[PDB]
Amino acid sequence: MIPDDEFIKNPSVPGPTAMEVRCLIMCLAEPGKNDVAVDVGCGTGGVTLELAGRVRRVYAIDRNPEAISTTEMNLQRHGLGDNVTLMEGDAPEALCKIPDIDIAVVGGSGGELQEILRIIKDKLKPGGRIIVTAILLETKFEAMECLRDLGFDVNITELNIARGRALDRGTMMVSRNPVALIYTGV
Amino acid sequence: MIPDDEFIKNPSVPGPTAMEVRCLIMCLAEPGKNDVAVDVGCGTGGVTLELAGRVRRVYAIDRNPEAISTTEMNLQRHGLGDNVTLMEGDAPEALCKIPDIDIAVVGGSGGELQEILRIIKDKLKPGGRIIVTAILLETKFEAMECLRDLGFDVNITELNIARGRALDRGTMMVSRNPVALIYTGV
Amino acid sequence: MIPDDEFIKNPSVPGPTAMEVRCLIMCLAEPGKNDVAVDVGCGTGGVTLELAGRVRRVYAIDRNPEAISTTEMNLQRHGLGDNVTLMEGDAPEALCKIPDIDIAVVGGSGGELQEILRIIKDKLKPGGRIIVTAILLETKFEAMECLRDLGFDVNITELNIARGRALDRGTMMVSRNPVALIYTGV
Amino acid sequence: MIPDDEFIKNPSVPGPTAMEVRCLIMCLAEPGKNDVAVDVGCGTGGVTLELAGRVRRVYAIDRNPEAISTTEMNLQRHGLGDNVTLMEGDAPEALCKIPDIDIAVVGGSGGELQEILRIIKDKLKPGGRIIVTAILLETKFEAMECLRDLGFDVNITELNIARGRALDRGTMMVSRNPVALIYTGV
């Protein structure tokens, strides 16, 4: 997996998602080379990158132009992007212009989460997977609720990662903020 | 990834390792189809399974006969095992009968961790990766120390996972015990 | 603090709350010998005990008879209870029969959390503190939301505790499930 | 408890210790108004503060002059310090100039942890308590080992705290680095 260090950040663009989380999302999404995926709120490009290398097509969406810019840069740094359709603008509008999906990774809460999820449920091919990355306590709840309301079997996994930082004095554990992955049964 | 639920457990055999951890081990190990791997202390077979599907050869070792038995069963349930050499008995003895390795996943502390690590360092192909799964606070330290003494750049990641369990009353977060992954730089 | 071990458990009654959590609730609640406190959903009696020894009066409420029973037993084992009014039945009904409070520790989600909180806000003496112990992901959200809606400054602290268990092989870290303490500014 | 916010920090002086940890240390230490306590490596003064208000005497030690300086300031901001003997210099040297102790809170690993612990064991009144705050993975192990070697019953509790930070977008959980408290049975 591309570690967080090899990502070109941008002060106004959140990310990249911790490799440990990207790790897990990849396993939950269980990409197939014929799967069409959508990464809503692609940020620095973390998930898009990982998906780019394992699925047929990836539609990366984000309101923030700098994010599409950063994701673009990062795809190029890692020579991916041939199969990645970057998309500027409002997630719900963008999502309508997309084909049906097998995998949906929704990071960007962007308020309109419930709307995005409804849209996604409608474009989800049978056996599709939705994975919502929640940073805000509200998103954890809202995602759980929507997914259940859209008739999905919802699961949730909260990841608390700590990496050691070598100091002269020794190895200190440094925490990433908790990240929850709300995902629908396959 | 095969979820913990699809594993055939055995009351006397610990495991399977949380999918979230197996997930991360897979990313840290970064299996190559030409990589030879060894899973010391294969338990229920979790890591062996994951590795089986991504590397050339996997040598699964474990003192406990029931573990070799359970891993054997689980390999079959998931149609893997063709490239998995199961091995009974003392890990250091078994390890000497193995070819050089690219990836080493050492779970089974089995006391003799330091000895296993020494053996492994000697059979580690250049650019090889060692990942020690530590359940015991002592193994976290002992592994860090050996790895550093054997001249490796040691890193550590503690994973605290919680999965929601749906109750009538609502979703409750249930913790897995902390698991640390001590790993050598690639 | 009375450690979890010295509590008389009851298979049908959840608790006691990890000493680490009780410890923190005690500090957030900042009991004063003249403070009147209410422990909604007193379970095994953990918080009731701690409060009993530091405040003027403690009203312990719980739907479950076994819990009032168990809390009663534990109060006696530790010679407290002189200043503890145990209360059987529905929390909202019981809460109305109570005097105004300085401290409110709400553990028992019991569905009716929002109602309990509204009742509590109305009986909260100026400078009072509310602390809701959340086990369920929904309660974390719901409590945050209510407290904010009732005009409180809401804070949240998620505790992930792990205690070592000495085995022959060594000390192993054992996790308690995550517990969140949603509390109102003083 | 004095929250982390009301502490006068100093860029070169680590601390204050998270209120959640200070909270727990106070409970494990179980101060008595007649207890003599020593805070080795007093940092910003967190523990010293808490102890100051509950025990007879507190000897605060720290190599770093800025730390004794900052602790000094903080004691004054909170009108404590009348019963606090600040001490400059090498912890082992300072420790010999102290009377016997009931409570010892050792934060400052300062390398010489094992030496400090031996000294403390010798000055520990019967039924005394030692609590070592470990930030470094090495200290967790070393403390456990010494305490056991000095014939103490050693216990350990790893605390992973996350506090919500209110953003416009919502509440986000922010982690403190893991902190372990190794403590001797009373």
- How was this structure determined? It was done by X-ray
Identity of the residue in A19, A30, A157 whose CB atom sits nearest the CB atom of B20: A157
Contacts of B151 (CB under 8 A, 6+ apart): B121
Identity of the residue in C155, C163, C164 whose CB atom sits nearest the CB atom of D164: C155
Looking at chain A from residue 4 to 63, which residues have their Cβ under 8 Å from any Cβ of chain D?
Answer: none
Which candidate, C56, C154, C50, C143, places its Cα nearest to that of C102? C56
* Final resolution, Å: 2.7
Is C167 near chain B, with CB under 8 Å? yes
Contact between residue B183 and residue B124 where contact means Cβ atoms under 8 Å apart: no
Q: Which residues of C touch B156 (CB under 8 A)?
A: none
Report the residue of chain C nearest A178, measured CA to CA: C158
Phi, psi of C119, deg, nearest 5: -60, -50
Determine the distance from the C-alpha atom of residue A31 to the mean position of all C-alpha atoms in its chain, rounded to a whole number: 13
Contact between residue A6 and residue A162 where contact means Cβ atoms under 8 Å apart: no
Tell me, letter by letter, the H, E, C secondary structure of chain D. CCCHHHCCCECCECCCCCHHHHHHHHHHHCCCCCCEEEEECCCCCHHHHHHHCCCCEEEEEECCHHHHHHHHHHHHHCCCCCCEEEEECCHHHHHHCCCCEEEEEECCCCCCHHHHHHHHHHHEEEEEEEEEEECEHHHHHHHHHHHHHCCCCEEEEEEEEEEEEECCCCEEEEECCCEEEEEECC
Domains of chain D in start order, with CATH, are 2-186 (3.40.50.150)
Contacts of D161 (CB under 8 A, 6+ apart): C157, C158, C159, C160, D18, D20, D21, D175, D176, D179
Contact between residue A61 and residue A47 where contact means Cβ atoms under 8 Å apart: no
Q: Which residues of B touch D158 (CB under 8 A)?
A: 178
Residue A155: DSSP 8-state:
E
Residue B82: DSSP 8-state:
T
What is the enclosing helix (H) or strand (E) of A174? strand A171-175
- Contact call for A109 and D172, based on CB within 8 A: no
Contact between residue D7 and residue D73 where contact means Cβ atoms under 8 Å apart: no
DSSP annotation string for C94-133: HHHTS--EEEEEE----STHHHHHHHHHHHEEEEEEEEEE
Q: Residue A51: exposed, middle, or buried by beta-carbon count in 10 A (0-12, 13-18, 19+)?
A: buried
